[PDB]
């Protein structure tokens, strides 16, 4: 579940640029 | 009705560069993320590049890595690959793919054939 | 090594379940993958999402014939029903973020056909 939250995360900072 | 649409693919030779162009509509191309796969001619995929919505942070593979640089520009709703000391194994047909907010290469194009030889 | 292992070809009868095996390596074995379908002379396309609990998800117009499963490192797709439209190579793929790096990984591709 850790790389599915690390994945999660990436592609909200794709869209979002955090 | 998401569409994308590459050009700029053809023959070049060895050491050499090239421009791929992406053009896309039927979404809003500045709120994604957009990458570049690309198929060699025994038919595997390989991830190229990819850039986040407002161009503000790039990632690619050690493969092209210094020698390949994604680009876009969001007035234009265009994605764009330069390409730079090329060689014969990086020929392949080049596909542009767009994020959604759950997966990487959700729409992908029709793709640009580039030739890479003497 | 990120590395994701599928057999080269495939082969079912029409109307018959099929199952496509994707497995990753051994310290991968909790990682979401992807699948990916490509029809002959034609651009790959977005099949699924699949987490290591089975739960997956579709892309917008896939037959809902296509379902996925998982078992330990194992990452599956299933066909129900099999049609001759679904003959194609079928990929997975998985992406990480190691540090500020991200890298993404295909198989090699399964290439499917449908007899009978």
């Known amino acids: 579940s850790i790389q599915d939250l690390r994945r999660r995360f990436f592609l909200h900072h794709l869209i979002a640029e955090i | 009705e998401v569409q994308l649409v590459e050009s700029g693919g053809d023959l070049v030779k060895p050491g050499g560069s090239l421009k791929l162009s992406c053009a896309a509509s039927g979404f809003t191309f500045s709120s994604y993320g957009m990458s570049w796969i690309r198929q060699t001619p025994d038919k595997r995929l390989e991830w190229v590049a990819t850039?986040?919505?407002?161009?503000?942070?790039?990632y690619y593979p050690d493969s092209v890595k210094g020698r390949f640089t994604i680009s876009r520009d969001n007035a234009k709703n265009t994605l764009y690959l330069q390409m730079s000391s090329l060689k014969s194994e990086d020929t392949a047909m080049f596909y542009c793919?767009?994020?959604?907010?759950?997966?990487?290469?959700?729409?992908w194009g029709q793709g640009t054939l580039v030739t890479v030889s003497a | 090594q990120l590395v994701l292992t599928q057999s080269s070809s495939a082969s079912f009868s029409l109307g018959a379940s099929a199952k496509l095996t994707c497995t990753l390596s051994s310290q991968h074995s909790t990682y979401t993958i992807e699948w990916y379908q490509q029809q002959p002379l034609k651009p790959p396309k977005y099949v699924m999402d699949l987490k290591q609990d089975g739960s997956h998800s579709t892309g917008d117009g896939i037959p809902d014939r296509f379902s996925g499963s998982s078992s330990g490192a194992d990452r599956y797709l299933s066909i129900s029903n099999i049609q001759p439209e679904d003959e194609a190579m079928y990929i997975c793929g998985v992406g990480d973020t190691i540090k500020e790096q991200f890298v993404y990984v295909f198989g090699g591709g399964t290439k499917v056909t449908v007899l009978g």
């Open positions: 850039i986040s919505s407002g161009g503000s942070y790039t």
């Open positions: 793919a767009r994020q959604t907010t759950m997966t990487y290469f959700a729409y």
